Every structure is written in C-alpha cells, then in structure tokens.
Design a binder for these strands. Structure first.
Ligand code: NA
Ligand code: NA
Lengths: 144, 148
DNA sequence: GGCAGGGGAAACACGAAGCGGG
DNA sequence: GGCAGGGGAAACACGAAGCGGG
C-alpha cells in the first residue's frame, strides 16, 4: 500500500502544479479583460492579506471557466488534455472552497465567431493569463 | 497487437460501444428515435447492402444529438457517457469510408434545449429509451454488417 | 469503502530528468 | 512516424469470465 495522505495545502499545491503542467502541455501544443492579480487583492508580499487574496483566487478561477470552455472547441488535436485542464480547475475551485451565466453564453459566441487569427490570439493570451494567475496563486497559497 | 480489416474494425467498434452502453444503462413515448424497419433493408429478406448501409449511417447521425443529451444524464459517470459518444463519432467515420442524410445543425438544438426543460421523471424515461433504441439499433447494425 | 479521497512527482542570469474495477 | 492506425476481446431455454509519449 503506497500513497502518503496529504493536508489541504499540500493537496491544493499539488493541484496547481498539476494545472500549470497541463497548461504548459497546451502552450507547447499550439477586447480581452482577463483576471490579472493586483496589489489591492493582497496576493503579493507588498500589502499581503490571507483573507482578501483567497477571495480573489476563487472569484478569479471562477471567471476563467468560460475561457476554459472556450479552449475546448479550439484544440482539435489535444482534446482530452484541454478537458483535463477544465476539470482540474473545477476540482481546484472545490479545494479552495473548503478552506473558506448567459453573459458567458453571449461572450462565448463573440469569441467563437472571430477569425482564426483573432481566435488564436485569444487562446494564446488566455493560456498566458491563466499561467500568470496560477503561478502567483501557488505563491500566495504557499503562505495562506 | 495484430492488424484487422476495415470490416473487422467496424464489427469491433460496434461491440465496444455496446459494452459502454450496458455499463451506462445499469446506473440509470413522444420522441422520434431512429428505428430499423423492413424498408431499411437490413433483414434477411427485403435485404439490400446499399440502403441498409445508408440507414445505419443516417440513424447513427440522428442519434448524436441524443447522446449529447446523455452527457449530463450521467454526472456520476461523465467519462463513460463521453466514451460512448465519441466512440460513436468514430464508428460513423469508419462507416462513411465504407460508403448522405444529415439533419439541420440548427433544429437539433431546439430539441436539446427543450428535452432539458422536462421534470426529472421524464428525463429518466427519456434516458432509458435513448439507450434502449440505440442498443437495439446497434444490435441490428452489427447483425446486418455480419452479412453486408 | 475498499488496499484509499472525494477515473486515476535542481539547474538555466529568477524563467529536462523522471508510479494503481465496480 | 515510429515499435503500429488514424489517447489507447461459451453458455444461459436466443438474452460471466476476463491487456501498451511527444
Ligand atoms: Na477508487
Ligand atoms: Na469510487
């Protein structure tokens, strides 16, 4: 019998690492107001805040789900992987909730009716803003 | 592993799907579901490879929107529904190479969005009869192909 | 649950190597 | 492509036993 039973932080930490790896295996296999961390949210060392930041992470991740749904009908060569980023994020959003809709429908169909040049631009910068957001989340969480 | 013919891939592709349905169906009237009839030509008499073949494709194209409806009907088996759905996508392609009637890409949604507005018993019934038809349909397709 | 939680892991100027059905 | 194609198989009245990443 082999697996060490983990605490909340370890579990959450491992999950983000799981997601960052996945995303990167989509970065290799490849108007916009995407969530970027701010100092007022209290996730950086300057003006740090364990309460305010956790709210920004859960709020943020939740706002990324639609843009993750977007990425699904975008990777016709890496389908299951792009799904595994979608579900792992959901999974992540549930680990961060222990510790503590048609606007989407419309803005999906806007992104999804742009030309390929625009759609691959959207893809590119979604993935990079997801990476930004996760890395700095892993960092903040490596404290509280 | 050893290699197989195009016909012996189709036969396995169906068998694979039929076992992924038996698994689904274990956990979980006014509709219009694809149903083999004498007119199709998939039976020992009144038989015809061409028409039978066409209807096997056609009927499987018709089923797709209903399998998409299945995804949410197995929240506690999301991948089993998905395998079944995408393993059917493949089957169609295989069949299409061995070769049509494709329903509108805008009428299938009105049905899908409506189905989802039924109370939880009608969904339960709708689910049990999607599987039943689809199984019987694939049961007949297999037998027919094991002849032509 | 169970064999067990909720189908399946140090070096480059700091940005490739290497543990599981119903 | 490669190691190969296009991420991963008898016995009950006819309806359980048990094979591989980029
Ligand atoms: Na398990
Ligand atoms: Na389980």
């Amino acid at each position: 019998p082999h697996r060490q039973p983990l605490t909340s932080s370890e579990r959450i930490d491992k999950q983000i690492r799981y997601i960052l790896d996945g995303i990167s295996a989509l970065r290799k296999e490849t108007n916009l107001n995407l969530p970027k961390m701010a100092e007022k949210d209290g996730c950086f060392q300057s003006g740090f805040n364990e309460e305010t930041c956790l709210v920004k992470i859960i709020t943020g991740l939740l706002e990324f789900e639609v843009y993750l749904e977007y990425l699904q009908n975008r990777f016709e060569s890496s389908e299951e992987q792009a799904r595994a980023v979608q579900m792992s994020t959901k999974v992540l959003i549930q680990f961060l909730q222990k510790k503590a809709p048609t606007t989407n429908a419309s803005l999906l169909t806007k992104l999804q009716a742009q030309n390929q040049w625009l759609q691959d631009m959207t893809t590119h910068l979604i993935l990079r803003s997801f990476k930004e957001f996760l890395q700095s989340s892993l960092r903040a969480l490596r404290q509280m």
